[PDB]
A paper describes a structure:
Our structural analysis shows that [name] is made up of two regions, residues 147–270 and 408–763 that co-fold into a structured core with an intervening glutamate-rich region of unknown function that is likely unstructured. We find that the RRM domain is required to bind RNA, whereas a basic patch in the C-terminal leg of [name] mediates the interaction with FLASH.
Based on the incomplete model, the N-terminal helix was truncated at position 171 with the aim of producing better crystals. ARS2171–270+408–763 crystallised in hexagonal space groups P6522 or P65, diffracting to 3.2 and 3.5 Å resolution, respectively. A nearly complete model was built, making use of information from maps calculated in each different crystal form. In mammals, loop A (538-ASEPGT543PPLPTSLPS-552) is highly conserved and proline-rich. In most crystal forms, the loop is disordered presumably due to flexibility. In all crystal structures of hARS2 (except that with loop B deleted), only the first part of the loop is observed with 570-AEEEELL forming helix α10 (‘EEEE helix’). To accommodate the same intermolecular contact in different crystal-packing environments, some angular flexibility of the loop B structure is required.
Author numbering:
A (entry chain A): 173 to 269
B (entry chain B): 409 to 537, 553 to 577, 599 to 762
Write the structure that this text describes.
């Protein structure tokens, strides 16, 4: 007759009943929403992968190190990444100049 | 003649301090979609200290007057929660320096190994692709020395730093993992600024870099990085049985017998369809064949419960 085990179990059971329908909780553990959110998360990550490889070949990391000497160049590179993440063409980058 | 450039990096946004967990994204999206120039909604991870309340961020186009949008949404509740938003100003300091010891050879050589493992793990974890930046990556970790020439006759290293930057820029742009700070920004892709703050090497130490202090940095830094590759915790097979892991096929059998109700003698009415049967064996054949949509949902409910029950690092009250 363990009180601690019965308390942790009842707290867990009362938690599941309370947070059943909530979207944050469903997203973590419910098979359908975990499957849908992971595919959505993978698609967003695959978009970011193309942005990195675009910045590689275009040459935004060509002469750019992670040092505060080139703090201005990093901010410009970061803005160039967000433009490409939003589906921005090479014409759209010209406002950084 | 070509079109106007679009400043997509700049985007003004709102900030809601307290959002209840009963409110979904669709309710906040549908509320703000009626306003012109709506883009996306972000919600932080709910914290148990505040009864699982989230922090919201509604992003908009930079063309729109955010101050008037903030005023219109001021006294508007959703379900029962006052949203009461404020204007989120832009990020002031985006390139933050850290300690300057991180440009030393031995730390740079060590960070290439750690950064490579972060990429190796996260590329398998998220399941992209092999990654071309990790081709012959162990060839930079090994030392090259003129030891034979010294035996007979008896700081900054730019080549390694260029290699490290490609790994850290990959981690930060793709996986949203700020390496030098040792932290993920998981919601960034929904948040107002898609790639905000990045952390950068310091200027240079004014005094000599000590012999043991290099080893102490490496020990302390890997200690900070270890939670980033944390596989999700799970209870043991006995401990899950104590807490009450529901069996899928057994719980489905309970659903059948509960629905297989006996109205009278040679009368077995089930409430799912509402049709009479002569015996309980006929009702089981009816539920399995015809109502195959319901028995899937019972298995999903059990898995939904078991995934929550199995997770040792469980969301619970403080």
């Amino acid at each position: 007759n363990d009180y601690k085990l019965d308390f942790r179990r009842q707290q867990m059971q009362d938690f599941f009943l309370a947070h059943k329908d909530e979207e944050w909780f469903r997203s973590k553990y419910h098979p359908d929403e975990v499957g849908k959110r992971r595919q959505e998360a993978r698609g967003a990550l695959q978009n970011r992968l193309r942005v990195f490889l675009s910045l590689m070949e275009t040459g935004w990391f060509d002469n750019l190190l992670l040092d505060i000497d080139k703090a201005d160049a990093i901010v410009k590179m970061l803005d160039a990444a967000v433009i490409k993440m939003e589906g921005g063409t090479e014409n759209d980058l010209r406002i950084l100049e | 003649l070509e079109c106007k450039p679009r400043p997509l990096h700049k985007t003004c946004s709102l900030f809601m301090r307290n959002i209840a967990p009963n409110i979904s994204r669709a309710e906040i999206i549908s509320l703000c979609k009626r306003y012109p120039g709506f883009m996306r909604v972000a919600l932080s991870e709910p914290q148990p200290e505040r009864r699982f309340f989230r922090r919201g961020w509604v992003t908009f186009d930079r063309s729109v007057n955010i101050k008037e949008i903030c005023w219109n949404l001021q006294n508007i509740r959703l379900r029962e929660c006052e949203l009461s938003p404020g204007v989120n100003r832009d990020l002031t300091r985006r390139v933050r320096n850290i300690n300057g010891i991180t440009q030393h050879k031995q730390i740079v050589r060590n960070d290439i190994k750690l950064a490579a493992k972060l990429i190796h793990t996260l590329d398998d974890r998220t399941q992209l692709w092999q990654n071309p930046i990790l081709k012959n990556i162990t060839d930079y970790l090994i030392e090259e020395v003129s030891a034979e020439e010294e035996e007979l006759l008896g700081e900054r290293d730019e080549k390694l730093i260029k290699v490290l930057d490609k790994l850290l820029l990959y981690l930060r742009i793709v996986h949203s993992l700020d390496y030098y700070n040792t932290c993920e920004y998981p919601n960034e892709d929904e948040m107002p600024n898609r790639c905000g703050i990045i952390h950068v090497r310091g200027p240079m130490p004014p005094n000599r870099i000590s012999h043991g202090e290099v080893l102490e940095w490496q020990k302390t830094f890997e200690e900070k990085l270890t939670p980033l590759l944390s596989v999700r915790e799970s209870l043991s097979e006995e401990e899950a049985q104590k807490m009450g892991r529901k069996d899928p096929e057994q719980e489905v059998e309970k659903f059948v017998t509960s629905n297989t109700q006996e109205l009278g003698k040679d009368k077995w009415l089930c409430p799912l369809s509402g049709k009479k049967f002569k015996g309980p064996e006929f009702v089981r054949k009816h539920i399995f064949n015809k109502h195959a949509e319901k028995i899937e949902e019972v298995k999903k409910e059990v898995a939904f419960f078991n995934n929550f029950l199995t997770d040792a690092k469980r969301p619970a009250l403080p």
